[PDB]
């Protein structure tokens, strides 16, 4: 019923990996002019990708995977892992009366309403769940270790890594929310909404290159642009 000592070590390992990956408390509060906006967005995205790789690397069993499968998982999960980690900050690191200022600031910039509206709908939707930092870290590792990604040769090897993380998360959902027995189903339900961002991001990327905005070599490599 409760988390076994092995599950607690596994959770604590993941949490240590998740905390060692943190963006500045200077860049968060400060979050500007028109052309400087397109430069901050390119730094934000690079920072997400740098943090995502560092985190993934440390996931139990990831280093035992085929080198091509590792690249496919990284490339396939980057957008979804980025939207999930931003939701963690938006709901838990940053207060209610602060997220709204960030929404207005991002809208008044270049970026499309077709991109912003679903982005904040997801943040409000996932925010209602009152998720702990352990729930965000496990859901991020689950999103990354998706066996259904394009170019995955050994799918069962990825499924073997993902299954124990889903087990810990299912237990954490009862222990922290026994009043709402559907909390876990709601968390997995939020992943369907999270998968739509792959299409939205790809649209936003084609507009980025024609509006003559710069891409860093890392962003070009992870998204093929």
């Amino acid at each position: 019923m409760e988390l076994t000592p092995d599950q607690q070590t596994l959770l604590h390992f993941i949490m240590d990996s998740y905390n060692k990956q943190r963006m500045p408390q200077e860049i968060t509060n400060k979050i500007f002019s028109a052309e400087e906006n397109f430069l901050i967005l390119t730094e934000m995205a690079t920072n997400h990708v740098q943090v995502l790789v560092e985190f993934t690397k440390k996931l139990p069993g990831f280093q035992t995977l085929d080198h091509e499968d590792q690249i496919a998982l990284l490339k396939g999960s980057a957008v979804e892992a980025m939207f999930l980690r931003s939701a963690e900050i938006f709901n838990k690191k940053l207060p209610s009366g602060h997220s709204d200022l960030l929404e207005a600031r991002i809208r008044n910039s270049g970026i499309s309403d077709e991109y912003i509206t679903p982005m904040f709908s997801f943040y409000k939707s996932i925010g209602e769940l009152k998720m702990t930092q352990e729930e965000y870290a496990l859901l991020t590792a689950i999103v990354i270790l998706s066996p259904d990604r394009q170019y995955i040769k050994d799918r069962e090897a990825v499924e073997k890594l993902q299954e124990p993380l889903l087990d810990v998360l299912q237990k954490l959902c009862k222990i922290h929310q026994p009043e709402n027995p559907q909390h876990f189903a709601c968390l997995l339900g939020r992943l369907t909404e999270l998968r739509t961002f792959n299409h939205h991001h790809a649209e936003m990327l084609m507009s980025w290159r024609v509006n003559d905005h710069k891409f860093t070599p890392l962003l070009c490599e992870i998204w093929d642009v």
């Binding site: 740098q50 790789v53 560092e54 690397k57 080198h67 590792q70 690249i71 990284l74 490339k75 070599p217 890392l218 490599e221 992870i222």
Partner: peptide, 11 residues
Amino acid sequence: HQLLRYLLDKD
């Protein structure tokens, strides 16, 4: 994919 492998393989 030069940068991505570097980030994956580095110590």
